[PDB]
Design an enzyme around this catalytic site. Structure first.
Site, PDB file in Angstrom:
ATOM      1  CB  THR A   1      -0.952   0.029   1.216  1.00 40.58           C
ATOM      2  OG1 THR A   1      -1.885  -1.052   1.114  1.00 40.58           O
ATOM      3  CG2 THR A   1      -1.731   1.341   1.292  1.00 40.58           C
TER       4      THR A   1
ATOM      5  CG  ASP B   1      -1.572   1.147  -3.812  1.00 39.56           C
ATOM      6  OD1 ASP B   1      -1.712   1.589  -2.651  1.00 39.56           O
ATOM      7  OD2 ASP B   1      -1.443  -0.069  -4.067  1.00 39.56           O
TER       8      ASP B   1
ATOM      9  NE  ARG C   1      -0.268  -5.046  -6.781  1.00 41.60           N
ATOM     10  CZ  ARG C   1       0.893  -5.291  -7.388  1.00 41.60           C
ATOM     11  NH1 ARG C   1       2.004  -5.485  -6.681  1.00 41.60           N
ATOM     12  NH2 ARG C   1       0.945  -5.343  -8.714  1.00 41.60           N
TER      13      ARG C   1
ATOM     14  CE  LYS D   1      -4.680  -0.141  -1.407  1.00 41.24           C
ATOM     15  NZ  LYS D   1      -3.234  -0.451  -1.253  1.00 41.24           N
TER      16      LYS D   1
ATOM     17  N   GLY E   1      -2.303  -0.895   6.486  1.00 39.13           N
ATOM     18  CA  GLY E   1      -2.295  -1.880   7.570  1.00 39.13           C
ATOM     19  C   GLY E   1      -3.403  -2.902   7.401  1.00 39.13           C
TER      20      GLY E   1
ATOM     21  CB  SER F   1       4.534  -1.729   1.986  1.00 37.32           C
ATOM     22  OG  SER F   1       3.576  -1.700   0.944  1.00 37.32           O
TER      23      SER F   1
ATOM     24  CG  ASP G   1       5.632  -1.361  -1.885  1.00 36.03           C
ATOM     25  OD1 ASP G   1       6.311  -2.278  -1.378  1.00 36.03           O
ATOM     26  OD2 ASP G   1       4.471  -1.089  -1.507  1.00 36.03           O
TER      27      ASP G   1
ATOM     28  CB  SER H   1       2.044  -0.118  -3.932  1.00 36.98           C
ATOM     29  OG  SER H   1       2.258   0.084  -2.544  1.00 36.98           O
TER      30      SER H   1
END
Ligand SMILES: [Cl-]
Ligand SMILES: [Mg+2]
Ligand SMILES: [Mg+2]
Lengths: 226, 250, 241, 244, 224, 231, 196, 243
Positions: A1, A17, A19, A33, A47, A129, A166, A169
């Site tokens: 994320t 993002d 995902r 999100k 989280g 992340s 990342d 993500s």
């Protein structure tokens, strides 16, 4: 994320993002999100996904009742105070990491929040992340007195850094812009840089391919008359 | 200390009457007139802003209250009792419905929850009944537009149109002659203003009348754009100017 | 006739204990007045020290609830202090939970809700007080909100409370009928206090010394009470024109 | 202290009667009449709404007949608000039983549970009783079609035909006269409407003053159907039976 | 259950012919860091009792407040609060011992070792120990922590049994205590040079000495 | 009249009738005397029987080695209050290694009785108590009323006909206060005091109850042939 | 964290770095660690950010309610409220707080409340991970009754060294000055204090 | 009627008759007074000697709260003790949380709110005492008097009990004749006189005088009882003035 928040001239912008993962597997490729706490107070969560979703709706519900009780439009500092006290009480067991942004009669605001209950103020923030990839972009291109167009550009560029670098993500960029004296504009799938290419082959089967033992009509209707 | 009144204060008399409920209804009868009319494409609820003093700012006292984005309420009787019932009704819409199903309750079920609260004040220990009658107007997807009356006993009834309080008997007769099943919302507002004028003594204008509608979705009152399925509240309180415009075509 | 002892309905749909609590409100024989300026809200109240053995500095019916909110009370001092302590606790809790200062109108509503409960629950009696809350709200500006034993509350352009409230009320009504505005068009709070004292003198028909009055002033971000010498300066200015 | 204001709702009279129960029954005698008739092939529930208005929205209105589950329904006589409290409790009990045993609750077990709740308010707690009498119409695979009644005392009894509310003395005599054991639902529908037509305090019995329901095995093969009649359907059955 | 954070080291004490002496240094350690240098660990209660405390300092400050409250409470409705019904050393100890044992029994101890020194109404010397476990004992000499290992052997050479108490003057006793404090400074890594000393005598009352220092030290021989 | 239904109601003259009625139960009770010198404190109590087959109701209760009382009124209420005193004496010894001062014991009894006079549902205690004891400030005598009022005295009497004994002690004040180091003479004075309250009946061997506490004397009760010496 | 508070002639000054750390990652490089619990009673926070924020918010609530009833609280009173929360909840908290305030009767005062929940009144106090490296420097350079300019220099130089050696400390140096004249905020940037 | 049978019931006047009946119990009690001096306060009380068998100086009436507050009351003595016990709990919790000893105005409200709470319900009875109390804090000396209704104010001098009218008149003379103020030692002497003068309303039985004081200079701001020579000196001064 990857989630970010960026202050600008006359408001604040948040982005994320799309995902959501279960270990190394992508559960949903177009996840939402960006959450709404109130019409002009939005937050993005990293989280434990159920915790960010649940804590947002609980505080959002109580914020709505508070707004009705006081005959005033909700404030970001109220959402912040209610979120941090709830999260502190549960000692980090509610795994919600949030960036909270919005406009209210007091002005425009940007805060972040960590599962244990600690809060932060800033002109630019990142969580998740992909926060290090995003913060690298923010630290390279942020300046004072950004315009609306510059802030949207910076925020989405920071999410892209998370998307490409990342593994946690990916997919698309969602954006929400909250400007003073205006309706908050939610821009779902603001960028779509990850459409899957056409497959080499069609995998539609001939009819009758699957072996069947029994067929029967399922009664979904209620008990009938006569 | 401790609340040592654990017994009922409302009891059956030899004739089968529940005295405290009857007396609560008497308090409602003394209250200022309020009404509700249902149209094909909306519902209207209205009442008089009986200002206690001209030094008082009557805009700060709301007799017509939003319960949910698609449900509104008005009353006749004791104002303070109404105010706390609105607080409880707003909360119960969330705790017993929205936090469970992720959507606002339909009109009939919110009415049911308010009724339950009013019934309990008629049987629980050490309390008196609420001294109000409520008129609750609302819309929901599967039931359409609706209008309900709730009494101190906790009983509730659905209406096409009705009135409660001071001049309710005369007002209900006036509504019976004018109501039909083909009324548009503007026609219902017109009839509401005509009906309300009869029970008002003094000034009759946008500053002394409180009027709200349940009608079309108001995307301009949503506060945000970007979600197609969210189209805004159906509850809207008419402004002082909007009322006065319709008093010239009266 | 036990419907007169506890808060249940009489056959006429009345609550006698609430009505009798309104009567206790005038037991102190003190009149209060509140008005709004451009930038301020002023509240004045009569001060009577009938005993020479009393310390006059401790005799007060004006309370500093929070930094921004002031409260004047009409009624006996025990019930007044009961309401004061609760209002202070509520205002402090509000700031802790919701992260901003409790508005004057919201505190008034909260105390009005508490009062409503005493009219419905039998074991609790109503408080024999009328509470006038004043502030300069950050959203609504100068504000006057008044609560009574019935649980009723409303905002005011100006207001008066006490045995001779009607005389003061009519006097204020007549002034606002002339000016056609919702406030005292004056820059300084000093002159708004002078307006308040002048119109109380006119309405009651009595003169005041520095020890006969009690004054509270609300400005942006603070509410404060005036000393006897601050009031004296106010009285001197009134007499000199 | 507080004792002074206590009515003492749960005491015997010198004659051994419960004051509040007796007075609650007096209240119920002014409520609209509800009738239940049990036949071999089903049960009928008929009930009169109390002096209505032309501006009452009838098609969305419910004051007399309530569904407890797919097999059991009730007719109400008394305080509607009191009844809805008990009705919701009964609906929950039925679902508790279904969850526990994976079978629909037998009619008598539901009736006993609600009746025990009513009994409690007459023996302890110092609260007023519920001013409600129920007629229970239901079906289970043990006893088949069943009619019960319960009143504020918490006492319940089984019936072939029964009335509650206003004019029960007159209604019960008329039912006792024309009821027979081999009767069918269509005959029972007619008896219920004829009885209400004669006992009513209104000038004439019309569709807008009635609520009507049937529980039939007139559901396609070995199963039971509940039918809460619509306003137009009550109007049709009034013409069919020759009352209007 | 916890762990001590800010701590105080040894408390040492002994009886003599006319009373008792007690001493403790003025340090509050934070592990190996000698963090706080002005901590008073002897707390007088009235004019007949001195309570010396080692171990956790936060818990010491709590006990200090309990003792302060005890004096206030004893004075309530008590016309003889400064006479026959004043607090005795034995009353103060038994109260503390009760609290310590109760706290260990709830698995939430006050992490301390305590010595109560004083003189009773009849002139009798009082000296008794209590710790985080609620363990209690009395002896002609008493010491906590390092003091138990190094001070007691020195103090027992002066008063070895009960019959040695009447033969021991206040000058000889104070001399022994002061020497023991020097030895502890040489050898305890969590000790300081600065200390307090209190004498409770049946004739001359309570003498409280602050800002005392370890002197007459030998290091010279370190040049070889 | 209209104001005696419960303990939570003042009369128009500011009286508490339920408390006054509880005081009346003491006046119906049998006489008991208390007196002290500077070394000792003595209780003397006239025990009452139901009839000739019955025992004589005990009047004196030990609370600790250094403290005890005599009762007049409802005996079960004395058992409740004496049990409370036993516990408080005991708490003082266990926690503080300290014998409970007689004056402090009086304060505790006052506060326990007071709570039953200001709350709904309860009732006042229906018994009067005479507490004697020897503590760090010497001998003491206390009189307890269920109104809550506790008083420290040289001597007193409560119960039926207690006024005769109280007048005698008021005359003898200067004599019996000086009876130091002579337990027998102090008891004699107490037996002579309680005799001023007798009518028709006299002090017999199963009628008389005596208690004493002092400098080197634990609280001890004398009954039966142990009091024949004083008859 | 590197935090400190120092009393001087005209009152007291609080100082702090601006670094917040989750491991080796600097989660916030411009943090405000100087927190207001009353008009002229402030505190420096070290330890868990969640814990010290929760405690400071509760103390601010307590002192706001104290003020409404009893008027302006003393610095000692503020320290006591901090202590009560830290001592009674020692098992569940990781907080090291320095409390600093200005009265007109008592002037500048400093109280330090370490991990255990004990209270220590001091002429000056240092705390946080970075404080270990400046115990020597501060002890040698602190004097009582310094001027405002001298105290600013003492704190600037002290926290400069703490930042230089402690990886957990860094960013800007903030200060808050508490005197009779009022409340003054100061900020000092890296290019200034690194060359000292 | 019936409005006076239950506490917390408003009469048609707006009065709480049960509270007014509690005042009657106060008026029936012995005389107690309070005098505010230059740097402190003095308390005094009349103790009726019902019998020779009462041990002199033993039945102490004035009570200390914390170490700086004195309390005296007239009316039902047990009710006064109950109020002081609560006051001691309030003072202990204040000092526990805030460290500093409770200020006198703060302490006054704690008692006030507690007494007022006993006028809110019919399940409790109002206090049958008027309490005169005060002491020295950081802002100086304070004297208060608290009634059964919960009402309290600050005073220069205060009196309650059977001889309150006599005492009040004497206190008013002192206020007029000393605008600059009264010393602590003067206030003790004057307190003795006023109790002796107020004893005319209770002239049947003889009495015992009891005095206490808190003064910044004379007692270091702590509450102490006046004993021995200073008490006798005040008794002599009082006896001289009545003759
Ligand atoms: Cl509320
Ligand atoms: Mg009530
Ligand atoms: Mg660094």
């Amino acid at each position: 994320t990857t989630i970010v928040g960026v202050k600008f001239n006359n408001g604040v912008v948040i982005a994320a993002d799309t995902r959501s993962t279960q270990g190394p597997i992508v559960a949903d490729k177009n996840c939402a999100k960006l959450h709404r706490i109130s019409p002009k107070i939005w937050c993005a969560g990293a989280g434990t996904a159920a915790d960010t979703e649940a804590v947002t709706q609980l505080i959002g519900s109580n914020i709505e009742l508070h707004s009705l009780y006081t005959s005033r439009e909700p404030r970001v500092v109220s959402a912040l105070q209610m979120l941090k006290q709830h999260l502190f009480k549960y000692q980090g067991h509610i795994g919600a990491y949030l960036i909270v942004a919005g406009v209210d009669p007091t002005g425009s605001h940007l805060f972040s929040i960590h599962a244990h209950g600690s809060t932060d103020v800033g002109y630019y923030l990142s969580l998740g992340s992909g926060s290090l990839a995003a913060m690298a972009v923010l630290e390279s291109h942020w300046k004072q007195d950004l315009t609306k167009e510059e802030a949207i550009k910076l925020a989405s560029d920071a999410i892209q850094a998370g998307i490409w670098n990342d593994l946690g993500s990916g997919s698309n960029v969602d954006v929400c812009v909250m400007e003073i004296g205006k309706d908050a504009e939610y821009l779902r799938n603001y960028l779509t840089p990850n459409v899957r290419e056409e497959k080499q082959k069609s995998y539609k089967f001939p009819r009758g391919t699957t072996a069947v033992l029994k067929e029967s009509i399922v009664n979904i209707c209620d008990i009938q008359e006569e | 200390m401790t609340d040592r009144y654990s017994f009922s204060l409302t009891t059956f008399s030899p004739s089968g009457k529940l005295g405290q409920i009857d007396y609560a209804l008497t308090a409602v009868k003394q209250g200022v007139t309020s009404l509700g009319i249902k149209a094909t494409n909306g519902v209207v609820i209205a009442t008089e802003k009986k200002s206690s003093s001209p030094l008082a700012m009557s805009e700060t006292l709301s007799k017509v209250s939003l319960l949910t984005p698609d449900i509104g309420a008005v009353y006749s009787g004791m104002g303070p009792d109404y105010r706390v019932l609105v607080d409880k009704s707003r909360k119960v819409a969330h705790t017993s419905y929205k936090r469970i199903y992720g959507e606002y309750p339909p009109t009939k079920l919110l009415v049911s929850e308010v009724a339950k609260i009013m019934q309990e004040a008629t049987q629980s220990g050490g309390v008196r009944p609420f001294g109000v009658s409520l008129l609750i107007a609302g819309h929901d997807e599967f039931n359409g537009f609706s209008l309900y009356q709730v009494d101190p006993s906790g009983s509730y009834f659905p209406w096409k149109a009705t009135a409660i309080g001071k001049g309710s008997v005369a007002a209900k007769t006036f509504l019976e002659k004018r109501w039909n099943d083909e009324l548009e919302l503007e026609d219902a507002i017109h009839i509401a203003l005509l009906t309300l004028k009869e029970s008002v003594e003094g000034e009759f204008n946008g500053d002394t009348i409180e009027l709200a509608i349940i009608g079309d979705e108001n995307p301009d009152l949503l506060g945000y754009t970007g979600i197609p399925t969210d189209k805004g509240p159906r509850f809207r309180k008419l402004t002082s100017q909007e009322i006065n415009d319709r008093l010239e075509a009266l | 006739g036990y419907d007169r002892h506890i808060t249940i309905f009489s056959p006429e749909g009345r609550l006698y204990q609430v009505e009798y609590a309104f009567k206790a409100t005038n037991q102190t024989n003190i009149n209060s007045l509140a008005v709004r300026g451009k930038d301020c809200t002023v509240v004045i109240s009569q001060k009577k020290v009938p005993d020479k053995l009393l310390d006059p500095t401790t005799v007060s019916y004006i309370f500093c609830i929070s930094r921004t909110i002031g409260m004047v009370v009409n009624g006996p001092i025990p019930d007044a202090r009961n309401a004061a302590l609760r209002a202070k606790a509520e205002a402090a809790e509000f700031r802790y939970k919701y992260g901003y200062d409790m508005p004057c109108d919201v505190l008034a509503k909260r105390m009005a809700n508490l009062s409503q409960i005493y009219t419905q629950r039998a074991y609790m009696r109503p408080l024999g007080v009328i509470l006038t809350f004043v502030s300069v709200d950050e959203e609504l500006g100068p504000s006057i909100y008044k609560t009574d034993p019935a649980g009723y509350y409303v905002g005011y352009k100006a207001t008066a409370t006490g045995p001779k409230q009607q005389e003061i009320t009519t006097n204020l009504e007549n002034h606002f009928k002339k000016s056609k505005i919702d406030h005292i068009n004056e820059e300084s709070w000093e002159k708004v206090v002078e307006f308040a004292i002048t119109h109380m003198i006119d309405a009651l028909g009595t003169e005041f010394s520095k020890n006969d009055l009690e004054v509270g002033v609300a400005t942006k971000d603070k509410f404060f009470t005036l000393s006897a010498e601050n009031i004296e300066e106010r009285l001197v200015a009134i007499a000199e024109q | 202290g507080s004792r002074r204001y206590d009515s003492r709702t749960t005491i015997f009279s010198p004659e051994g009667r419960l004051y509040q129960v007796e007075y609650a029954l007096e209240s119920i005698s002014h409520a609209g009449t509800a009738i239940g008739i049990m036949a071999s092939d089903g049960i009928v529930l008929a009930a009169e709404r109390k002096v209505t208005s032309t501006l009452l929205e009838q098609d969305t209105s419910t004051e007399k007949l309530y569904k407890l589950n797919d097999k059991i329904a009730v007719a109400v006589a008394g305080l509607t608000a009191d009844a809805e409290i008990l009705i919701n409790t009964a609906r929950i009990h039925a679902q508790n039983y279904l969850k526990t045993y994976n079978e629909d609750i037998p009619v008598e077990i539901l009736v006993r549970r609600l009746s025990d709740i009513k009994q409690g308010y007459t023996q302890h707690g110092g609260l007023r009783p519920f001013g409600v009498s129920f007629i229970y119409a239901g079906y289970d695979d043990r006893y088949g079609y069943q009619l019960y009644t319960s009143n504020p005392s918490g006492n319940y009894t089984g019936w072939k035909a029964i009335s509650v509310g206003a004019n029960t003395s007159a209604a019960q005599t008329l039912l006792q006269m024309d009821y027979k054991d081999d009767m069918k639902v269509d005959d029972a529908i007619e008896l219920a409407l004829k009885t209400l037509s004669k006992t009513t305090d209104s000038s004439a019995l019309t569709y807008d003053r009635l609520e009507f329901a049937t529980i039939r095995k007139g559901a396609n093969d070995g199963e039971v159907y509940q039918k809460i009649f619509k306003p137009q359907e009550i109007k049709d059955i009034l013409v069919k039976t020759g009352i209007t | 259950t916890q762990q001590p954070i800010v701590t105080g080291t040894s408390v040492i004490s002994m009886k003599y012919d006319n009373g008792v002496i007690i001493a403790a240094d003025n340090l509050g350690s934070y592990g190996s860091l000698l963090r706080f240098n002005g901590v008073e660990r002897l707390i007088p209660v009235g004019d007949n009792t001195v309570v010396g405390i080692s171990g956790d300092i936060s818990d010491m400050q709590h006990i200090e407040r309990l003792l302060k409250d005890l004096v206030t409470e004893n004075a309530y409705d008590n016309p003889l609060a400064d006479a026959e019904e004043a607090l005795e050393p034995s009353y103060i100890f038994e109260y503390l011992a009760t609290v310590m044992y109760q706290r260990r029994s709830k698995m939430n101890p006050l992490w301390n070792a305590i010595i109560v020194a004083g003189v009773q109404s009849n002139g009798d010397q009082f000296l008794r120990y209590v710790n985080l476990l609620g363990v209690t004992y009395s002896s002609p000499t008493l010491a906590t922590g390092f003091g138990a290992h190094m001070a007691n052997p020195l103090l027992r050479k002066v008063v070895d049994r009960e019959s040695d108490i009447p033969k021991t003057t206040v000058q000889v006793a104070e001399e022994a205590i002061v020497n023991a404090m020097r030895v502890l400074y040489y050898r305890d890594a969590r000790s300081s040079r600065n200390f307090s000393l209190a004498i409770i005598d049946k004739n001359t009352g309570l003498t409280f000495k602050k800002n005392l220092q370890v002197e007459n030290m030998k290091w010279d021989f370190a040049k070889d | 009249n209209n104001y005696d239904g419960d303990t939570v109601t003042f009369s128009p003259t500011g009286r508490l009738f339920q408390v006054e009625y509880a005081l009346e139960a003491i006046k119906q009770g049998s006489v008991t005397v208390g007196l002290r010198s500077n070394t000792h404190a003595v209780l003397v109590a006239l025990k009452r029987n139901a009839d000739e087959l019955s025992s004589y109701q005990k009047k004196i209760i030990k609370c600790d080695e250094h403290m005890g009382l005599s009762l007049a009124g409802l005996a079960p209420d004395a058992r409740v209050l004496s049990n409370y005193l036993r516990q408080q004496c005991n708490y003082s010894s266990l926690v503080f290694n300290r014998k409970l001062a007689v004056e402090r014991a009086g304060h505790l009894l006052c506060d326990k009785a007071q709570k039953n006079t200001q709350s709904y549902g309860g009732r006042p205690y229906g018994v009067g108590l005479l507490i004697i004891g020897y503590d760090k400030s010497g001998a003491h005598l206390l009189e307890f009323q269920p109104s809550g009022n506790v008083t420290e005295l040289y001597g007193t009497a409560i119960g039926a006909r207690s006024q005769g004994a109280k007048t005698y002690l008021e005359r003898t004040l200067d004599t019996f206060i000086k009876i130091d180091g002579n337990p027998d003479e102090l008891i004699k004075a107490g037996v002579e005091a309680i005799s001023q309250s007798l009518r028709d009946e006299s002090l017999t061997v199963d009628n008389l109850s005596i208690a004493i506490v002092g400098k080197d004397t634990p609280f001890t009760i004398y009954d039966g042939e142990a009091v024949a010496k004083y008859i | 964290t590197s935090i400190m508070a120092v009393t001087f002639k005209d009152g007291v000054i609080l100082g702090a770095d601006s670094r917040t750390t989750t491991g080796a990652y600097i989660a916030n490089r411009v943090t405000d660690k100087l927190t207001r619990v009353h008009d002229k009673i402030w505190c420096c926070r070290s330890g868990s950010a969640a814990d010290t924020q929760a405690i400071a918010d509760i103390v601010q609530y307590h002192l706001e309610l104290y003020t409404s009833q009893y008027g302006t609280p003393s610095t000692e009173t503020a320290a006591s409220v901090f202590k009560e929360l830290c001592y009674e909840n020692k098992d569940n908290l990781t907080a090291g707080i320095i409390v600093a305030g200005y009265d007109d009767k008592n002037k500048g005062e400093v109280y330090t409340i370490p991990l255990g929940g004990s209270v220590h009144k001091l002429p000056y106090a240092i705390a946080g991970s970075g404080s270990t490296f400046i115990y020597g420097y501060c002890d040698k350079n602190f004097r009582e009754n310094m001027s405002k300019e001298e105290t600013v220099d003492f704190i600037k130089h002290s926290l400069s060294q703490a930042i230089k050696w402690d990886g957990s400390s860094g960013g800007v140096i903030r200060m808050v000055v508490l005197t009779a004249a009022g409340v003054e905020r100061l900020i000092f940037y890296p290019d200034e204090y690194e060359q000292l | 009627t019936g409005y006076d049978l239950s506490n917390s019931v408003f009469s048609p006047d707006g009065r709480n008759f049960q509270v007014e009946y509690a005042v009657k119990a106060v008026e029936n009690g012995t005389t107690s007074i309070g005098i505010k001096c230059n740097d402190g306060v003095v308390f005094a009380v009349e103790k009726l000697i019902t019998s020779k068998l009462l041990v002199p100086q033993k039945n102490v009436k004035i009570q200390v709260v914390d170490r700086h507050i004195g309390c005296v009351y007239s009316g039902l003595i047990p009710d006064g003790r109950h109020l002081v016990n609560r006051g001691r709990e309030e003072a202990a919790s204040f000092k526990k949380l805030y460290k500093t000893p409770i200020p006198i105005p703060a302490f006054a409200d704690r008692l006030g709110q507690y007494v007022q709470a006993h006028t809110l319900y019919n399940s409790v009875r109002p206090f049958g005492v008027s309490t005169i109390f005060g002491g020295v804090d950081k802002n100086g000396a304070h004297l208060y008097m608290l009634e059964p209704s919960g009402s309290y104010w600050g005073y220069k001098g205060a009196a309650t009990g059977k001889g309150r009218q006599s005492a009040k008149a004497e206190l008013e003379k002192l206020v007029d004749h000393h605008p600059e103020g009264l010393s602590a030692r003067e206030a003790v002497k004057q307190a003795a006189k006023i109790i002796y003068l107020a004893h005319e309303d209770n002239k049947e039985k003889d009495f015992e005088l009891e005095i206490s004081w808190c003064s910044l200079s004379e007692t270091n701001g702590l509450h102490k009882f006046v004993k021995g020579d200073l008490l006798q000196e005040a008794i002599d001064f009082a006896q001289k003035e009545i003759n």
